[PDB]
Amino acid sequence: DNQKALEEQMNSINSVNDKLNKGKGKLSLSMNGNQLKATSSNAGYGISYEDKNWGIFVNGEKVYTFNEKSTVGNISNDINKLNIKGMYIEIKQI
Known part of the structure; x- marks a missing residue:
């Protein structure tokens, strides 16, 4: 297997x-491994x-917990201190 695969390139990130x-x-996402890097405004x-x-x-x-009213802008700030990693990304309700 090669790092050219969907390892760091998780389609789930894009979703x-x-x-x-x-x-x-306002929120500009950026990628690193499977991290969700971002800049946001209110x-x-x-x-x-x-x-x-x-x-x-x-x-x-996990790496993220939110409600749509909590708005990922304020959350992403804090989420970026989670020491985010990358290998198995999931997308689902809680």
């Missing part, structure tokens, strides 16, 4: 990217979405 970055706050955040909660998992562990 999360396009899932979170829709009708929330130019509106989650209004459209009332309340939905799901979680993202890395290596099979």
